[PDB]
Amino acid sequence: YFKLKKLEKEYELLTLQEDYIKDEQRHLKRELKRAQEEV
Amino acid sequence: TTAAPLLALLRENQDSVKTYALESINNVVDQLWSEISNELPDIEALYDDDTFSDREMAALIASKVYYNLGEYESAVKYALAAKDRFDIDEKSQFVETIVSKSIEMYVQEASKQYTKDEQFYTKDIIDPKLTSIFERMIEKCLKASELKLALGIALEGYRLDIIESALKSKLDQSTSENVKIINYLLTLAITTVTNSKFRSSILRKSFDFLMNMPNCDYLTLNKVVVNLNDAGLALQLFKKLKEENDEGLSAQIAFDLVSSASQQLLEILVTELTAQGYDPALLNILSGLPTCDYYNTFLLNNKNIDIGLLNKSKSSLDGKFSLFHTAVSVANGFMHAGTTDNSFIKANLPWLGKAQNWAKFTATASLGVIHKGNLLEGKKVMAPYLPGSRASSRFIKGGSLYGLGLIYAGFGRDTTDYLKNIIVENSGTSGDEDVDVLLHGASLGIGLAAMGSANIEVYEALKEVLYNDSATSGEAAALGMGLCMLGTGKPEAIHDMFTYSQETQHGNITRGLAVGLALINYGRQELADDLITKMLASDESLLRYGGAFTIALAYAGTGNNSAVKRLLHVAVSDSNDDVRRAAVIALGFVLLRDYTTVPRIVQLLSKSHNAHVRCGTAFALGIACAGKGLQSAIDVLDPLTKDPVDFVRQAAMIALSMILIQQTEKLNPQVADINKNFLSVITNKHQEGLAKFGACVAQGIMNAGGRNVTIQLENADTGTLDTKSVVGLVMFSQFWYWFPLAHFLSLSFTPTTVIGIRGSDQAIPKFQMNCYAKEDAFSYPRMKYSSKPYKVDNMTRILPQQSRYISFIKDDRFVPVRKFKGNNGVVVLRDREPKEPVALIETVRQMKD
Amino acid sequence: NDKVRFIKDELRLLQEPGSYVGEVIKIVSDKKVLVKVQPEGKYIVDVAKDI
């Protein structure tokens, strides 16, 4: 049960920490693809 | 064997037999539930048959199958149905699973019930069976009798019923543990719970569990209180204190306090303790000037200088006309911050020639820095450069105005208001740049001291000074006004600010408003979101811009992932870089409390097509670890210290150096390079006064206040935030925008002082308490735990850590009640044996104070 | 982003005044290399700081 409460809990941060990224990517994806153009 | 015989038995009559069926079936369900899995509808009908008793058998039987079906709420429900067929102490993994499986389900319900009601658990809404079994497991957790186990559950179980009782029951004051078990969850609670109220509920009871006082830890309660910001508690304490009344007990509590409660909050207790009757020492601890003294005393003592190298920098160029010549106006101030020295100031009198009216102004502001914490002289220091003593430049004359409160922030309100009067004097008129600066420099220093002090006038008088639309003056207004209402502030300003923002026509005047918004949107979090959204909704950076800071000052420290997440994509997506950059920067605030992944985080943005990204990176990262480690985080930035744009690395220089004070020398070897790289750059003529600037600054950063002072926010010493610690950065954030800024950075400057002090009025008996650390007071600029006597513990370098491998000697006259509280700056060996040896020591305080 | 920046990077470089290939005729102690530009005549001219 417990030290997880300490331990376990902290890892949804990672869950989140994971989560953010694709977002950045999709942007970045688009970012290239829009930047890619004038190139 | 096979249950078709049982599936035979199923609908076969004689509930007796069917009893027997179930029973018999039940024993062999384990294998044949599969076969049985089909008859569950009948089994369900069975459980629907009250006529036949055992059908909970069928229910639990079904539950078993349901496990073997993966059906759990099914199983749980029919485990719930059983209660009899089921027992917790029946041990099957399945049971112990559905045992578990039940437990969880409670929480969300409870959470969803906690959602609506916070006494929900006191009520029936949750299946009692669950809640029962839940608490019966809590019982089992109580029987586990390591109740953290129970706690984290009941934490999410949201039952203080559980918690408090389990506490009080188990309160035997495990003396310190029943204190700490609280803290274990309490400190955890700080980290855990969404709803602070829940946790706020904790902090009170805890305090009261502690107010049971088999001498509870007060600093515990302090931050607890400080997190609650509840005067009564402190007063209750103070009473309870006055009941217990002891100098060191009061002092340390006030030392707890003076380290902790907001300037704003604090004045309540001040007023309170005043009205309470009191110990004036406490009221004198409310000065904190003793520290300012001690700090200066420390500084003046413990300053480590090498202005020669600084001179070497100052001699490395006079140029950019002012702009680089400006940097050194500051880096010197760093080393001299609070240390009150003209060392180089005289070294160039032709300095002023190369100073520019703003640098002339700026150089003037550089003083209050140098004199910071000198609660008289600094004014007298500015006196010659005060208005009416004229100056060479009105802006020089203006610099004092701002430069003043640098020392007096929070304490110069009068002079401030006085200046405000002078402001108010020139407020509605006098568009003279000279006046404007005079206004502005005052319009600077006003909110400076007035920061955290809510005076509409501050806001107001500026509001028109603002509205007077001097990009010079009204800019500072856009700040001081915020500084005034920095806090939740008022929405009407917000309207008006936001109004003025779009309304008022100027870049910066419009801009800085965002700050004041962010200022007066502070900790508000969910509050400003609208304006945030509005700021988000801004076509312009400036609103969006500040929104990040707003979200920061809202969510700074504690991560709101979503906020962050918003902030990210917002930054990520947005057109304007500096938005991103700043937004990126603003991250490290809501991200402050965990610097941890920030490198891993900014690692994403360590790479970018865009410098500003990679610019924005450096700070937020350099912020979170400023008072921290992670060469990792550092070394991330070293290529970015080479990122082609000096401006980029200029940050990275600074950004790292923000981390890197006190950390140097084979503790951290690379500092030399870093310092060299500065010097490298600083020597490099083709490195910019972007680079050299930041370098010289970043250098002097590492060197600020005689390099012996530190940079702290959300201070683990207290555990508590310092808004002021924040501000200087945020202030300085825009600079190459508005150069006359950084002096704000002096805020987080923090002493490493270790000085005997007393748990009484201070004979300053000094001793080096000598418990060994691998020696990083010996790792530090030229120009682990052995539990062995450390060499020398008295002031200088120390470290928060190198503090904490050292411990006191009991053998001196004076002893702390807190068993080496662990914080160099806070000092205060508590006074056990006065009017005796342990001699006497004094300070410039003791001189004048 | 590897590409992205990198791709973008070239665009910068895709903007040039130029790089004159030139015929160094000689130097002097002046640290102005005495150089005939290929089509042009000689110009005694400072060098790249790295050369």
Next chain:
Amino acid sequence: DAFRLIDTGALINIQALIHGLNRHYYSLNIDYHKTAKETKMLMNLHYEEKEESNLAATKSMVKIAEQYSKRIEEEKELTEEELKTRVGRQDPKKHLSETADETLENNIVSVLTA
């Protein structure tokens, strides 16, 4: 660019003026602003879409041959490309996608019409 070559002091540059003889390019720092208003009216660049879009360039099939042949030609280029697997770019597994990927979409958009 915009020059105006002299300062007050500076952002206050300073010296060469009082030392006299200020000459240089000396740009200023440009910017500009308009609005989201014309932005629309701008981005209005590219009745309308329906008339402008789907349906207005649903013309494909006219080229199906090419649309084939274009796709057809992709094929050859690649056996080629793949082959080299047996250095630097033209690489055996590069233009492959960028080639067979350009005729994939443009060929799917037409389906919207039918």
Next chain:
Amino acid sequence: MASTAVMMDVDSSGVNDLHHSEKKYAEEDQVQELLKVLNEISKTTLTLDPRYIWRSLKDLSSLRNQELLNAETLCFKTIEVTAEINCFMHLLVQLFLWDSKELEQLVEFNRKVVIPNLLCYYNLRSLNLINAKLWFYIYLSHETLARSSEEINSDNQNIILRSTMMKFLKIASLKHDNETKAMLINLILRDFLNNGEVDSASDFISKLEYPHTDVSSSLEARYFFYLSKINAIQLDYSTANEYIIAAIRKAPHNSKSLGFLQQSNKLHCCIQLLMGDIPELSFFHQSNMQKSLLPYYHLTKAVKLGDLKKFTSTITKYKQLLLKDDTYQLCVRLRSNVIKTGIRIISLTYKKISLRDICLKLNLDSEQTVEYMVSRAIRDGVIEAKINHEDGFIETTELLNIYDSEDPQQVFDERIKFANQLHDEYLVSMRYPEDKKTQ
């Protein structure tokens, strides 16, 4: 020697010591690797007299000697914990008929290994360090019974075992409590294939596949293997084969290809029969009968014609071999199917043929059963024709179209749906170096 024997196991335990401090991937795959190299040393003369002495000492080590049963005498709580368990792993290894014959001795030992201090705390800790095969691989042998009076009672130790595996199926909590599992099923499956009727396999289905990744494709195929045989008399053919098609495709087996994959292939061969497809055994000429195909070929050989007698003759001939593989149940059907197959072919190629000329094939065979027999055939489609006896005209359809329909584009869609196979997989593995290179 025994030293080197021990030395190897020292390395094993040394690699067990890897896992001991949180490091399986090494250990397990090493243990996996070790399992193969285990054949080398083998035995247990001084390996154990030196093992039971090298490690430490525990009651169970004593009760283990009851399995050892010998005499040495001679002279000569942490490290000796899971090693001992990991050696209990090797204990099972000592049971292979490697270092054993009658594991019915070891049967109880297995339990007495399995059940005590084991099958206890191991959920995520032991990572399939259980080998329930090598658990049961023991019992697998003894199920040569016959003799046992099955088992005990009937046969409860296996029923127990099933329930014990069931007792794991609980323990399959999917805490990662998986890998070994559906062997349990596979056992139970083959237990069905021993006696039971699989269909609770549907429940076994209903649970899971051996989720997921780290399971041996072997089992994962062996999964399919029986799982094929589900559809066998479940009379799904493709999926059955698809299993095979997902079994032999990439199951990794050469040594075990030998007797064991033949089995697969056998049913696999049996598949196309189910569909009457008769691929060219022209390959199944090879690595086959010898001991597997050729009756299938004979079947095919028959099924090529599907000449009931000549068909039956094979069966008549090979029934026991069929019976040996219990593919006998099959083919009893495809008999007339191929008859109907021929009926369809080089025959329906007129828009008819008559009643009687198509009845001629039945005038070759039967009459006005034709009606049935043709309806029997038409019933299934599997042909497309009509008749009118009122016409006496057995009217044999086109089967003629173009790709005007979405039929191709179905396959395109089929292809489309696959567009994510390797495409989405590329991302499935994109990680590994890319992510581990960060490390």
